[PDB]
Amino acid sequence: MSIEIRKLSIEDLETLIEVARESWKWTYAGIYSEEYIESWIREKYSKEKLLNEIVRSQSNLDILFLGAFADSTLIGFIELKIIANKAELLRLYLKPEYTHKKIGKTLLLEAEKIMKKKGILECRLYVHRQNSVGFSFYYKNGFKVEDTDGSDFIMEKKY
Ligand SMILES: CC(C)(COP(=O)(O)OP(=O)(O)OC[C@H]1O[C@@H](n2cnc3c(N)ncnc32)[C@H](O)[C@@H]1OP(=O)(O)O)[C@@H](O)C(=O)NCCC(=O)NCCSSCCO
Ligand code: NI
């Protein structure tokens, strides 16, 4: 299969939401209710907010928003928020069927390459403690737990 990584653009908006929704329902099956997730997707992944984030990424401002496209179809994404010379990994979600094929590792490595080009040398993230899929992926990619906050572990990786 042919997997391409690039910045999202506004035309990706609808497939973006559908991927976010499908990944969330799978990822948080053990953890949140069907309705909580649907509410979160409708409030946080709203067309208006995602569009503003997609634009901020396009304008090389404080967001970096990339997608993984399999033969021209969005199957996953990563989103980073930059403040000063520190990045926070906000979101990294793949369609469940495309997991465990190193597409997420590839998203992560491309984001890392762009960050290093901008002189950013530190990435922090929030991962729910019961999300073993994500958590295990993170420590297998060099992230280390530095703290907790509520239900989440705060993990960090330095370059
Ligand atoms: C977490 C995601 C993005 C990881 O991307 P990949 O699936 O491409 O991971 P790989 O690079 O192939 O690495 C494989 C390792 O990752 C774990 N893994 C991956 N898929 C799994 C499935 N289907 N079941 C169980 N474990 C899985 C394993 O640790 C695996 O290593 P080995 O088993 O080979 O040793 C991706 O899986 C994904 O999108 N997951 C759901 C969403 C999610 O959890 N996202 C990140 C946390 S929320 S967001 C950012 C803020 O933290
Ligand atoms: Ni595995």
Task: Please report, for the chain, the start and end positions of each structural domain, with discontinuous segments joined by +.
Answer: 2-159
Which positions are catalytic?
Answer: 138
Q: How far apart are CA 86 and CA 69, in angstroms?
A: 27
Long-range contacts from 90-98, C-beta under 8 angstroms, 24+ separation: 91/20, 92/134, 93/19, 93/20, 93/23, 93/24, 93/27, 94/19, 94/23, 94/68, 95/19, 95/22, 95/23, 96/22, 96/23, 96/26, 98/68, 98/70
Binding residues for acetyl-CoA: 92-94, 99-104, 131, 136, 140
Look at residues 90, 95, 73, 151 and name the one whose alpha carbon lies nearest to residue 125.
Answer: 90
Output the CA 1–ligand 1 centroid distance in Å: 19
12 alpha-carbon distance from chain centroid: 15
Output the CA 10–ligand 2 centroid distance in Å: 34
User: Which amino acid belongs to residue 30?
Assistant: G
Method used to obtain the model: X-ray
Look at residues 81, 78, 88, 137 and name the one whose alpha carbon lies nearest to residue 111.
Answer: 78
Contact 71, 2 (CB under 8 A): yes
Report resolution (Å) to 1 decimal. 2.3
Look at residues 116, 79, 80, 112 and name the one whose alpha carbon lies nearest to residue 94.
Answer: 79
Residues in CB range of 50: below 8 A, 6 or more apart? 13, 16, 17
Contact 135, 143 (CB under 8 A): no
CATH number belonging to the domain at 2-159, selected among 3.50.50.60, 3.40.630.30, 3.30.70.2190, 3.20.20.70: 3.40.630.30
